[PDB]
From a paper:
For this, 3Dpol uses the viral protein 3B, in this context usually termed VPg (viral protein genome-linked), as a primer. Crystal structures have been reported of 3Dpol of the enteroviruses CVB3, PV, EV71, HRV1B, HRV14, and HRV16, and of the aphthovirus FMDV. These enzymes adopt a classical right hand architecture, with fingers, palm and thumb subdomains providing the correct geometrical arrangement of substrate molecules and metal ions at the polymerase active site for catalysis. Given its critical role in genome replication, 3Dpol is regarded as an attractive target for antiviral drugs.
This compound contains a central fluorophenyl ring instead of a chlorophenyl ring and displays similar antiviral activity as GPC-N114. As expected, the GPC-N143 binding site is identical to that of GPC-N114, establishing almost equivalent interactions.
Residue numbers in the entry: 1 to 467
The structure:
């Protein structure tokens, strides 16, 4: 991804977008009770914690493109993964607006808390001013869509979230694109059935884990990945995606039976128009994290990518014995013979991708079930039911997250959520967690699940329904 053109908003007649200047994260009542090193990301330019230039850092992820056509490796990659998705019987038919906007099995209702984007955001108009979760009204939306169209600029927001000292210091805050409500809805219409199928079929056929529930899904993973594990990091995945990969994506959507017209939306993602604060810029390549389907699409591409590096480096490779699961840039994979991930990483670099050893590793080491992570979680078989596998989020991370809040009114929900995570570290660990929570008076006011109830409900969860 490369920033092609940049100018002042006033010159094209765009109003300044008034994004928030201060963080919503403050120290929680638990901030002194636990250790942690992370702090809210830098959102403004004058932040005294900065040890680099902010405007420069946030955009620097835009490292460049490699100009090329789809090669022989890409094609055969596309076909293999095409071969897989066909099994699923994805409907290329649009989805009925009601479903696309207000929910259905496999596609959550369009979130009414996020930005509506341009131009509504400029006009003080909020999502809730347009949609209602009570009347399922589409009369207003239809007016706005007809009024303002598709293909609108995107609004760029600095992601307000906890980060390490290194990234606060370097100003490497992450950017999120708010798509215009219309484009959101349109895309949901066009791809809703794809999304529905992806969320209902996490695993090695979709090669996706987007929408999954670790609690249930972890147990499936080792079953699906028989082989020697392959795992690894990207750096700036979304924004390094060159246009070539989008060509491949639309190439794959075409085999699923999407028309050229219907794939024009991939271009909307690839060559993008952004309204940042008082600037207005055009970007060629780069997945614009935050528009509709960016996770699914990031995964699908990744599915293409890895199969392409396998093919180019290991002539002889049989892909039908390959298995992968992506969540956007996060990949876990297996082959029956060892694979040198470093080879792949160097190969990938010729395509403008920065691959790295898994979990900020020193070298592309042996990947076991002991050290493998996915969505920041480890795997540990339950001591008692060995076919059951715990998703184990590290305590360090739970400790980090507990020390801040964006809204103390939700403490109960927040601490329960963290509870749902921590207990996989084991009873000793869980009881220390609970004691320290409880060493503050607010901690004593919270309804907190007992370990033994967490264990029971989990064991009980793999008793009903599918997967
Ligand atoms: N469309 C849409 C859409 C709407 C919102 N929103 O705020 O209402 C947010 C993300 C949206 O994109 C997706 C819509 C449906 C999907 F099945 C998947 C979408 O993309 C994601 C799916 C999953 C995740 N995730 O959980 O990380 C992030 C994204 C993103 N961006």
């Amino acid at each position: 991804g490369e920033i092609e053109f940049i100018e002042s908003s006033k010159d094209a007649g765009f109003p300044v977008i008034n994004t928030p200047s201060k963080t919503k994260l403050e120290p929680s009542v638990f901030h002194q009770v636990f250790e942690g090193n992370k702090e809210p990301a830098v959102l403004r330019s004058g932040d005294p914690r900065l040890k680099a230039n902010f405007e420069e850092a946030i955009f620097s992820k835009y490292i460049g493109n490699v100009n090329t056509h789809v090669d022989e490796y890409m094609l055969e990659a596309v076909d293999h993964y095409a071969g897989q998705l066909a099994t699923l019987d994805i409907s290329t038919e649009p989805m009925k607006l009601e479903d696309a906007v207000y929910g259905t099995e496999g596609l959550e209702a369009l979130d009414l808390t996020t930005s509506a984007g341009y131009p509504y955001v400029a006009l003080g108009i909020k999502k809730r001013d347009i949609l209602s979760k009570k009347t399922k009204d589409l009369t207003k939306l239809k007016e706005c869509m007809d009024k303002y169209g598709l293909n609108l600029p995107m609004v760029t927001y600095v992601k307000d979230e906890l980060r390490s000292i290194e990234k606060v210091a370097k100003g490497k805050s992450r950017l999120i694109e708010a798509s215009s409500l219309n484009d959101s809805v349109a895309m949901r219409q066009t791809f809703g059935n794809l999304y529905k199928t992806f969320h209902l079929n996490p695993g090695v056929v979709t090669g996706s884990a987007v929408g999954c529930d670790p609690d249930l899904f972890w147990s499936k993973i080792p079953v699906m990945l028989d082989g020697h594990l392959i795992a690894f990091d990207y750096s700036g995945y979304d924004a390094s995606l060159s246009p070539v990969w989008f060509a491949c994506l639309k190439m794959i959507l075409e085999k699923l039976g999407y028309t050229h017209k219907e794939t024009n939306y991939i271009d909307y993602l690839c060559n993008s128009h952004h309204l940042y604060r008082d600037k207005h810029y055009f970007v060629r390549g780069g997945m614009p994290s935050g528009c509709s389907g960016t996770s699914i699409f990031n995964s699908m591409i990744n599915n293409i990518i890895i199969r392409t590096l396998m093919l180019k480096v290991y002539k002889g490779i049989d892909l039908d014995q390959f298995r992968m699961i992506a969540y956007g840039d996060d990949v876990i994979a297996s082959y029956p013979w060892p694979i040198d991930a470093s080879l792949l990483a160097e190969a990938g670099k010729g395509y403008g991708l920065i691959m790295t050893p898994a979990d900020k590793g020193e070298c592309f080491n042996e990947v076991t079930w002991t050290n493998v992570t996915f969505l920041k979680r480890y795997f540990r078989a339950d001591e008692q039911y060995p076919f059951l596998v715990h998703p184990v989020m590290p305590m360090k991370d739970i400790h980090e997250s507990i020390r801040w809040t964006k809204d103390p009114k939700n403490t109960q929900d927040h601490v329960r959520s963290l509870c749902l995570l921590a207990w996989h570290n084991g009873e000793h660990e869980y009881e220390e967690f609970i004691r320290k929570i409880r060493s503050v008076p607010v901690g004593r006011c919270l309804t907190l699940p007992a370990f033994s109830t967490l264990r029971r409900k989990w064991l009980d969860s793999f008793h009903h329904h599918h997967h």
